[PDB]
Amino acid sequence: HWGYGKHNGPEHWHKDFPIAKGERQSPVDIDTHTAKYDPSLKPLSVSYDQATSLRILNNGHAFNVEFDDSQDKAVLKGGPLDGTYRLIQFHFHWGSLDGQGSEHTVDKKKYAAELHLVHWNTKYGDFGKAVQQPDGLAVLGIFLKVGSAKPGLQKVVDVLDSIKTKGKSADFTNFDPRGLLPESLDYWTYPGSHTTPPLLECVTWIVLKEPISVSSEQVLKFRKLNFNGEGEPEELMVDNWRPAQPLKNRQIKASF
Ligand SMILES: [Zn+2]
Structure with missing residues (x-):
């Protein structure tokens, strides 16, 4: 099936998911000079004090931190959003080297990694139904650069050993997502899609x-993950990012 290799990479995805070359594909390049300042844009509201993490798993394309989304426990609102979005999981995209790894780029600059906090619109009742709506999901993207270590991230780094190969999982309770947020909530927003198959165009x-900032050692451990299942030839999980896609008329607005 799909992956990030020469034979099943992003350039091949269109064959199985024709939406690959749709009109609101993601990630894109954020041109800071073309992005439009929108004063009608409300401040983001991140309510994660009552978040409940459950576990972490290696799905063979990335690692996911799963949360209990049966109640409005960890929610995102405000900004360009209408209604309440519930956090379901978070994952990252990274590279083989520090000069690449992010999906979105700023003025063509690539970051070491990119964190995705995925949330779904409650009016649709479940994740599965939300992915069928134009306003079904809301993903918070955060860039990672290599500098000083991120204390909040170390809990995640230490458990990777445990989910080395495709299909493994481990209990992962009492993880507070708040340790991964930058100081400022200033942002850019545009309508797009998931960055992995089914590449459904349901994302804000x-x-x-x-x-x-994350330390060299912290990102190093990400790089020790495997794409492959246990007892199979070892394929390091690196460069699990999709290249920037055409903006195609869409406009990127700024909250600042
Ligand atoms: Zn992602």
Whole structure:
């Protein structure tokens, strides 16, 4: 099936998911000079004090931190959004080297990694139904640069050993997502899609301007993950990012 290799990479996805070359595909390049300042844009509201993490899993394309979304426990509202979005999971995209890894780019600049906090619109009742709506999801994107270590991230780094290969999972309770947020909530927003198959065009992108710094050692551990299942040839999980897609008329607005 699809992956990030030469034979099943992003350039091949269109064959199985024709929407690959749709009109509101993601990620894109954020041109800071063309992005439009919108004063009608409300401040983001991140309510994660009562978040409940459950576990972490290696799905063979990335690692996911799953949360209990049976109640309005960890929610996102305000900004360009209408209604309440519930956090379901978070994952990252990274590279083989520090000069690449982000999906979205700023003025063509690539970051070391990119964190995705995925949320679904409650009016649709479940994740599965939300992915069928134009306003079904809301993903908060955060860039990672290499500098100083991120204390909040270390809990996640230490558990990777446990989910080395495709299909493994481990209990992961009492993880507070708040340790991964930058100081500023200033952002860019545009309508787009998921960055992995089914690449459904149901996402309201919310990309934070201010990146979070992670240490060399922390990102190094990400790079030790495997795409492959256990007992199979070892394929390091690196460069699990999709290249920037055409804006195609769409407009990127700024909250600042
Ligand atoms: Zn993602």
